[PDB]
Amino acid sequence: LLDLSATELEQVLYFSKYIVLDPKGAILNGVPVEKRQLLTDEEYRELRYGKQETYPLPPGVDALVKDGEEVVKGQELAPGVVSRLDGVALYRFPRRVRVEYV
C-alpha cells in the first residue's frame, strides 16, 4: 500500500531512528528531493551539516586552496588533510603573507 521496499526499507525505519521522507523537501544530496524515499538517518544528519567540518592543520603546512574556494568530496584541501565533503573552502587564521611588494 505505502509503496516502500517490501522488507528492507520497512525494517530500516520501523524500529530504528531512520528518518522517513514524508511531505516537503526540495534541497538535495545530488538528486531531487525524494517523494517517498526514506534515506537512513546517516544520510539525514549529513544533509544539514553535510559540508560543515573543521579540518585542523599542523604548523608549516600551507594549503592547496586560497580561502573561499569550491572543493570536491575527497579533494585534498591541504598537503596533510583530505576533505570528506564538497562545497566551498574557507580559511581560519593567518600565519604567513607571501605576495609581491615593490
Binding site: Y55, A63, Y91, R95
Partner: protein, 171 residues
C-alpha cells in the same frame, strides 16, 4: 614578495587577493605598536591557515545594499543583496558577512521528518485510496509485464480497504 611572519596573537583584517599600497596596515595586531604597515604596493595573500573548513553554503559577493538579514530561508531566486543583481540558488540560513563583503547561504530546508511507527501512521492517513486506484488502474494496463505484476497485487489491496469501511490508518 616579502612574506612577513604574522604571529597568531596578531589579528589580520585582510581578504585574500585584496589591494594594498604603502599606507594601509595589513596585519593589524590586537596589540598596537610594531604592527606591520603596508609594505610597498600590490595585492595580498594568506598562507598556512590553522583550519581549512568547508561549508555547504554558496558564495554571493556584493558591493552595496544589504536587504536580506541573517537566518532566513531564501528561495532560489529571492534577491539577497546588490539591489537586484544578487539572488539565492538554494534555501537555508543566510549569514551576512560585512567583513569579507559577501552574503552566503547554507543549503537547508524545513523538511518534515519522522521515525518509528508514528512516522508511518501519518503517511497512511495521507494515502488517498482514491487517486491511487486510478493511477494503478492505468499502471496495470498501459505498462508491460514489468509494472503489470506490480499494480496487479498492488491495486487489490487498496481496493480491499475501500470496500471495507476501514481506513489504513487503523493498521
Amino acid at each position: 614578495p616579502k612574506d612577513y611572519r604574522v604571529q597568531p596573537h596578531m589579528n589580520v583584517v585582510v581578504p585574500e587577493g585584496a589591494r594594498v599600497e604603502a599606507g594601509d596596515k595589513i596585519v593589524a595586531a590586537i596589540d598596537p605598536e610594531e604592527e606591520v604597515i603596508a609594505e610597498a604596493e600590490g595585492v595580498v595573500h594568506l598562507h598556512e591557515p590553522a583550519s581549512i573548513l568547508v561549508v555547504k553554503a554558496r558564495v554571493y559577493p556584493f558591493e552595496d545594499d544589504v536587504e536580506v538579514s541573517t537566518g532566513d530561508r531564501v528561495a532560489p531566486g529571492d534577491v539577497l543583496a546588490d539591489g537586484g543583481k544578487v539572488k539565492s540558488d538554494v534555501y537555508g540560513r543566510v549569514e551576512v558577512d560585512l567583513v569579507r563583503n559577501v552574503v552566503r547561504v547554507v543549503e537547508s530546508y524545513d523538511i518534515d521528518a519522522r521515525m518509528g511507527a508514528e512516522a508511518i501512521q501519518q503517511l497512511l492517513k495521507e494515502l488517498d485510496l482514491e487517486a491511487l486506484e486510478k493511477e494503478l488502474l492505468e499502471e496495470m494496463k498501459h505498462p508491460s509485464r514489468a509494472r503489470r505484476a506490480k499494480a496487479r497485487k498492488r491495486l487489490e489491496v487498496v481496493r480491499a480497504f475501500l470496500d471495507s469501511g476501514n481506513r489504513p490508518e487503523w493498521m
